[PDB]
Design an enzyme around this catalytic site. Structure first.
Site, PDB file in Angstrom:
ATOM      1  N   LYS A 267      45.178  45.760  36.059  1.00  0.00           N
ATOM      2  CA  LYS A 267      45.846  45.416  37.303  1.00  0.00           C
ATOM      3  C   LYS A 267      45.487  43.994  37.701  1.00  0.00           C
ATOM      4  CE  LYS A 267      47.125  48.060  41.361  1.00  0.00           C
ATOM      5  NZ  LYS A 267      47.184  47.821  42.828  1.00  0.00           N
ATOM      6  N   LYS A 339      41.282  38.026  44.069  1.00  0.00           N
ATOM      7  CA  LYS A 339      41.929  37.736  45.340  1.00  0.00           C
ATOM      8  C   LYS A 339      41.039  38.154  46.502  1.00  0.00           C
ATOM      9  CE  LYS A 339      45.196  38.435  48.769  1.00  0.00           C
ATOM     10  NZ  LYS A 339      44.965  39.084  50.089  1.00  0.00           N
ATOM     11  N   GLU A 421      40.475  46.232  40.426  1.00  0.00           N
ATOM     12  CA  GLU A 421      41.021  47.260  41.304  1.00  0.00           C
ATOM     13  C   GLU A 421      41.152  48.596  40.584  1.00  0.00           C
ATOM     14  OE1 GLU A 421      44.169  46.152  43.815  1.00  0.00           O
ATOM     15  OE2 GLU A 421      43.126  44.318  44.413  1.00  0.00           O
TER      16      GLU A 421
END
Ligand SMILES: Nc1ncnc2c1ncn2[C@@H]1O[C@H](COP(=O)(O)O)[C@@H](O)[C@H]1O
Lengths: 446, 51, 23, 26, 51, 51
Positions: A267, A339, A421
């Protein structure tokens, strides 16, 4: 160059919207919308009897009925607070007066009157005694005023924005100003789904909007209800709604893949982007259809990611569409910056040493070949023969073949170990269905 | 006394008119009262309740 | 406040000069 | 061209709740 | 713009005379003050709002 | 009010004088009178003197 929008008072549209809002069931709202549409189409037919080529469509009213789908106009730069401030300034209301305080802290129910959560209602109540009973503005004039305000916000000018808002206030009624505020905020709360509006507009409009993502083309092509579209498929230089993934249960994952081998992939955290390439003409589109081409560069000469990958495409490929994820790369470590803290890939500062990396996971068109209807495996194979990856600037996401659950749990455990994630799973035979969720793509997290 | 009561009713009617102009809304729509007119009231009284 | 000049606020309205007026 | 004026023209079940007064008079 | 008597000044003339007198007084006394002249009820219009 | 706002200096006083001879400018339309009263109240709140 006559346009029907110049002959339709804005008060009529406001009344139609009010009637739609003040309706019990879907039937009455659809009836009102259909009556308005039929009147508009009859007037269009009457007006354009003689002219042959006409660009006039229902777009002028559509862009106001569905402000959230507007893409031609840039950000207005004004929200509830700024609108309240501008209304206070222009109306010359006292700063410390009751009306100004009510407008500013609109969420406080201290007023005990009207509504404590709807800013438009309070604006209408305030403007009721200060506004005329009949307006004199048309749809075209309102659209021009909104365009001027948006461009002028983009140009860093505020006196002109004030002038435009003052003109709108002076040439509108309380209800018209309330509706205008709602459109500026980009919320209408009509209670009718966008899908319902598109369906009533034309039999096949949701698919066209998904493929194109521009109210102008949908309004223009789908004018006569009888005439339809033979085949609608992804086209160059037109944003397409991306295909998302749905939650998946690890227990029955194999069942979700019809008991067949599948692809496990990592991911990627960051922006979702799609790239359109025709020669040296580049266009970049975001998740919802916004144009980010200015940031990443629409030409090899100037840009933030394109000036380096201009020459990363094999010579044969001339027209190419790709879908992928944009993220931040730290070279001194040679690792992807997850992120979150310390950076936003949407508005990265130039002086930072971090750079932009594009991880591709699908191809939709290569040399005027439409790959939307082909299987995932074929698209992967064609993708392998598009660009020679140049780490740090453009890459292909690795996918591992797996046909047991132990592999899925191993991948998820390793992903948690590498502080990611989760992991996603792709069905090898899945077709690309724009705007749909949970068709052949699944995601798994801890 | 009737004249004084008529004057008071007229003042109350002015109060109602100003409250309406202020944008105020009454919770119950049944309490609305029609404007008082002296000639109409006298005519109605004389035709109905005088006997 | 009373007897204030309508031309220059903040100043009292100066009366016209009357010169000498014998009793 | 006719004006825009011409082309627009603008079961269930019964529920009961008893309420018995408990005053000394009752 | 109507004069009640033949030997009298119309309202417009008196207003203009008063404005001129105030202008002269301001010039002599306080020349840094701000003054403006507007008309309402005319046929033409000239303003920022375009009323 | 817009003319007053256009000024960029600091204003110790703000005054308007109305030269008119019509005591009932709006007698036919009641809504216009209410709007004028509301505007006058707003101007007073802002700190504008009326004569
Ligand atoms: N490899 C990938 N392929 C396609 N979409 C992705 C991929 N990685 C992330 N996404 C996007 O990320 C969303 C899920 O959020 P997650 O990542 O926090 C998905 O619905 C996709 O829009």
């Amino acid at each position: 160059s006559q346009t029907v929008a110049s002959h339709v008072p804005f008060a009529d549209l406001c009344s139609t919207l009010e009637r739609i809002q003040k309706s019990k069931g879907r039937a009455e709202k659809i009836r009102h919308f259909r009556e308005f549409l039929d009147s508009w189409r009859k007037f269009h037919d009457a007006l354009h009897k003689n002219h042959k080529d006409v660009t006039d469509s229902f777009y002028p009213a559509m862009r106001l009925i569905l402000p959230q789908l507007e893409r031609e106009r840039m950000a207005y730069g004004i929200k509830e607070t700024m609108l309240a401030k501008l209304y206070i300034e222009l109306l010359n209301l006292p700063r410390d007066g009751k009306d100004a305080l009510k407008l500013l802290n609109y969420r406080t129910p201290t007023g005990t009157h009207g509504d404590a959560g709807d800013f438009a209602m309070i604006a209408y109540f305030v403007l009721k005694p200060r506004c005329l009973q009949k307006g004199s503005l048309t749809i075209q004039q309102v659209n021009d005023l909104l365009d001027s305000i948006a461009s002028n916000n983009s140009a860093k000018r505020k006196d002109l924005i004030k002038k435009s808002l003052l003109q709108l206030i002076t040439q509108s009624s309380a209800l018209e100003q309330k509706w205008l505020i709602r459109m500026i905020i980009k919320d209408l709360k009509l209670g009718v789904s966008q899908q319902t509006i598109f369906s009533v507009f034309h039999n096949d409009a949701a698919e066209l909007h998904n493929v194109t993502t521009d109210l102008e083309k949908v309004c223009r092509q789908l004018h006569d209800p009888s005439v339809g579209l033979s085949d609608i498929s992804i086209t160059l230089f037109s944003a397409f709604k991306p295909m998302l993934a749905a939650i998946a249960d690890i227990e029955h994952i194999e069942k979700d893949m019809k008991h067949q081998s599948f692809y496990i992939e990592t991911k990627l955290d960051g922006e979702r982007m799609q790239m359109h390439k025709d020669g040296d003409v580049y266009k970049y589109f975001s998740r919802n259809g916004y144009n980010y081409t200015d940031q990443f560069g629409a030409s090899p000469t100037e840009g933030s990611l394109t000036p380096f990958i201009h020459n990363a495409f094999k010579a044969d490929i001339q027209i190419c569409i790709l879908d992928g994820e944009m993220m931040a790369y730290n070279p001194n470590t040679q690792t992807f910056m997850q992120k979150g803290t310390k950076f936003d890939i949407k508005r990265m500062v130039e002086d930072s040493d971090l750079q932009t990396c594009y991880c591709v996971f699908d191809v939709l068109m290569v040399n005027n070949k439409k790959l939307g209807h082909e299987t995932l495996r074929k698209r992967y194979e064609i993708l392998s023969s598009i660009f020679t990856p140049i780490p740090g600037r453009i890459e292909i996401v690795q996918k591992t073949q797996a046909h047991t659950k132990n592999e899925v749990i191993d991948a998820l455990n390793e992903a948690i170990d590498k502080r990611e994630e989760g992991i996603m799973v792709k069905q090898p035979l899945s077709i690309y269905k724009p705007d749909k969720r949970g068709e052949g793509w699944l995601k798994i997290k801890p | 006394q009737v004249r004084e009561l008529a004057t008071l009713l007229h003042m109350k009617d002015l109060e109602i008119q100003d409250y309406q102009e202020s944008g105020a809304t009454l919770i119950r729509d049944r309490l609305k009262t029609e404007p008082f007119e002296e000639n109409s009231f006298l005519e109605q009284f004389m035709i109905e309740k005088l006997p | 406040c009373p007897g204030e000049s309508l031309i220059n606020p903040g100043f009292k309205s100066k009366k016209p000069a009357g010169g000498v007026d014998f009793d | 061209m006719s004006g825009w004026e011409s082309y627009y023209k603008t079961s269930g079940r019964d529920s009961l709740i008893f309420l018995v007064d408990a005053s000394k008079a009752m | 713009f109507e004069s009640q008597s033949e030997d009298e000044l119309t309202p417009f003339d008196m207003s203009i005379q008063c404005i001129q007198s105030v202008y002269i007084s301001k010039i002599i006394s306080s020349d840094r003050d701000l003054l403006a002249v507007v008309f309402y009820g005319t046929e033409k219009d000239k303003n920022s709002v375009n009323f | 009010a817009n003319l007053f706002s256009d000024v960029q200096f600091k204003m110790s006083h703000k005054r308007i004088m109305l030269f008119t001879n019509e005591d009932n400018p709006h007698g036919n339309d009641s809504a216009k009178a209410s709007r004028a009263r509301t505007k006058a109240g707003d101007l007073r709140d802002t700190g504008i003197f009326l004569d």
